[PDB]
Design a protein around this nucleic acid. Sequence first.
RNA 1: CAAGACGGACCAGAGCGAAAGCAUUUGCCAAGAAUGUUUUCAUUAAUCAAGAACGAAAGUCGGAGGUUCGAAGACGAUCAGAUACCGUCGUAGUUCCGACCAUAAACGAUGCCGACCGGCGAUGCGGCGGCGUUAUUCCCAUGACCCGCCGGGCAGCUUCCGG
Lengths: 325, 178, 213, 135, 82
Amino acid sequence: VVADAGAFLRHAALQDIGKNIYTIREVVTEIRDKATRRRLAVLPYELRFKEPLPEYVRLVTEFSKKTGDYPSLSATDIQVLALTYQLEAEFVGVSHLKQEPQKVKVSSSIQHPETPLHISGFHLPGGWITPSNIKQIQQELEVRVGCLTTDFAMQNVLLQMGLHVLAVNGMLIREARSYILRCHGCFKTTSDMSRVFCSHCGNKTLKKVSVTVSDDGTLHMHFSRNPKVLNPRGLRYSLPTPKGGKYAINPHLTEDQRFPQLRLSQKARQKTNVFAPDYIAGVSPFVENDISSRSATLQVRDSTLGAGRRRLNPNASRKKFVKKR
Amino acid sequence: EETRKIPVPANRYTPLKENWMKIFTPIVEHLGLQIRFNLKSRNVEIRTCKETKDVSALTKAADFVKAFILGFQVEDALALIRLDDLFLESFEITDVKPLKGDHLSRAIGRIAGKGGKTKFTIENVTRTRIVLADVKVHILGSFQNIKMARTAICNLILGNPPSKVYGNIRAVASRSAD
Amino acid sequence: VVDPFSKKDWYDVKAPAMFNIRNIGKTLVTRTQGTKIASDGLKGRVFEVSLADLQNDEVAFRKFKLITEDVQGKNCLTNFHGMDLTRDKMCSMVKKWQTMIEAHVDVKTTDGYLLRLFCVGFTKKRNNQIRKTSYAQHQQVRQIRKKMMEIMTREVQTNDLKEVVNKLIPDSIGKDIEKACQSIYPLHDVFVRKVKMLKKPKFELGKLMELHG
Amino acid sequence: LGPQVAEGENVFGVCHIFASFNDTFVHVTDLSGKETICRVTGGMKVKADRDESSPYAAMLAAQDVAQRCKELGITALHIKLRATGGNRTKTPGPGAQSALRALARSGMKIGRIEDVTPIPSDSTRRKGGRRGRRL
Amino acid sequence: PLAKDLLHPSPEEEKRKHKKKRLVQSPNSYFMDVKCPGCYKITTVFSHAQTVVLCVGCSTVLCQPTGGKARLTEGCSFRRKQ
RNA sequence: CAAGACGGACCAGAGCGAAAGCAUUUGCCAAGAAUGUUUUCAUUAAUCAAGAACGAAAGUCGGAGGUUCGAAGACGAUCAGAUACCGUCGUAGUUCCGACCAUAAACGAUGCCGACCGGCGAUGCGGCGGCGUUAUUCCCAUGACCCGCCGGGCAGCUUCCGG
Ligand SMILES: [Zn+2]
């Protein structure tokens, strides 16, 4: 029972479920959540710290770069993987695990990658969200040793190599359903769904591809056989000359170009929380907007705001009196 | 058990998809209601269950999700869940004044102002939230606050400059015993 | 001083045999006071009933107007008067980047009920489309409108109210229009949006019996 | 006094909630709609023309009309929300929302919510001039 | 830009251009020889023919006028002349 | 039930027209740009004093009609001085027919025709070339999408061409 940081973020109190609890210092000390550090001094102390061996982290990296997941992995992640590897090797016999895993099998469909399947509240033609089910919706929930990993990359490598891992649910998991980003220029796959530029060739070219991994160790990934996904419509447009200074915003063509620092003030990024015990004493129902600061005059916006505006093609026609920032 | 269904437009599908968990978590935890999103009819459907705590919570949920769909932020309709006396007046810009074409667009501009600042200024004086659909204006707040915001907005789209609007709305807020 | 509601009577009102749910509900009527007859007072009422209150399997965005025509001792039989769509549905159907095509016909059925049919249909953005708008040209729109007019004219003139109403409950007309108009331009959301009762023949009793049971 | 219906089945009424820009109207009728059971205006509760369109007046109207339906035996109501419509504003105001919330609060089952305002196909000329309306 | 051999452009480039904006004017049409499936009589038909043409020894339509190129009836064979 | 009115949402920096202007269905009438042509005429052209047609709204004559709105006008509120704002009603007018007037911020505050000088990809119409998905796999063409190209347009973005 090797606990990853995902169980600690989700308040997964599975300490009574297992007995061989082993954790890393750098998977518990980096968490900036206050409630986790609060409950850490409250939770019963039967977890213990263990260090992996350099040979086993070397082997774990050796087949993890054959799985095609090594750029997506992190150092403490490899610590967790090789810790579980060492525990299952030292307790259980080593003949269960298999190395140099299976090949991929390609089977595409007509469905869009943005089809809203496997969302709990979404239902095509009954799927309801009940307070009996709010504790149930975590993931695709299906003996002695296991993992408490929430990342798909960890589940992927642990299941390709062959360990039975589990979730916040007490029962061991069977299938892994998720999405990955694949470059369609260099054909390199990254398990990090947040990024937009690929690590290999750096173009803004990652696209979603669905991946399902069975309990045997066989993986199959579905592409989308849809002409809308691979369409060069809104891609070539005339670019402005690069401007410098403290105020210039650039069209963001590379993943690591140096942008000028344009942050928001504290009052500008306060969101009203309504379930605070002292919210009712507020003279206004809402947090007051910020108009006085210099960031308000410069029309500085959050990264989240204006997402569908970027998805419009620049070679189009907007409204006559509107200006796009 | 009874239910309410509310529709969603095409442009409001993605904000519903992104903020989905922040929508259905207070509906299912504090109110105790079943919720789903019918994709064929494109309707958010909320029904009462056996473990619903009290009546009129379904109407709170309907107001919450409808306010989110109209364009308000998820926190601003969580305010509708918690508070009692909050309402939604909405009206067309061409209602008070017959405007055609470009003039109408300029009216929209002076509801926003530069950078939206004028709009935010009203949100500081009337203590309300205001959402601009393409020809429509939605106000969320208390009744006298909604009326104050509506007078300010109608003063803006009859030609009055923002300075007179700020002065008048601050005077009215001063006499409002706030 | 005197409560006028002690002089009132509660009659039961029932749906025709076309629909699964019969019991529409209760109806208030003043008592017979010698001069005016209580049965004559309620003989010209229009009942607004949703389709969800008429059949369990069907959809709820359709409304039926029903005329009460006879009184059977605290029992009211209704006759079909009209059909309409929910305004919430109609508000949801009108999207911007598409073309709305509307048609209307004045058509007489076999048993003499002269009706007015309205049909609406929206242009559809297809599966692999990249363009924002899905506008159809004027001649294509005219051809679609024509095809609706002969479809409704053909499928009303040869039937009676039993078959017409049994067509309007699952909307065979809309699906037939959608199937037939695929050769001109693919359509998104086509329905018979409103049905009006222009003319009725002479009122009988055996017709209501065979319509109800 | 009331219908002779068992405790399982419920009877339906149609509550025309008409929230004009001066008061509110609560017109509870039969499913036919011809005969009125009750109608509580804003002006029947508050003795002030300033408070005529207040949500408090609509709340009191909804409470009194729900008491009237419980005295007769109406237990579930369909709702037809209305604004002034026509040339004027089409969207129902805060008074209609307050009345519906107060009527749902007082133990009454809600059926179908229907936004029936007299929306013109093509309007006549507006009440104000070319200058405008509402200050 | 600033270095273009206007005297000798590539044939793809001149084929792309408008027929009056070529270096030397040349039409986009031709004269096609059509053979009916029934008769053996060969007929010269202009590629953008505006009139409906009938076979001399068959009295059958060969092409139908359109906005641009006249479309051929089904079963007829055509060969471009030089 | 009737009366006159208005053609919302679809409605867009989309289209047409010399401009003012033009938005329910269908039928008729006479026009029009563009595109396509290895058709015909062979300079027949451009701008145009004099002169001639059209010309928003408001207004004036003769007829009809008056639903809404509504200048003037009548009241009601409001004040050291209010005689503009606000509320109710309402005349001419707003509607149609036939005669008048020729005026607008009748604006792109930018004459018309013709040539050359950077780039880009969206859209409307027409034409050309095409793997494919579709009309429940359509038996052939045809409509809708998709990818390029050319011509005329309504526009946009970008640029230290130069002003
Ligand atoms: Zn790449």
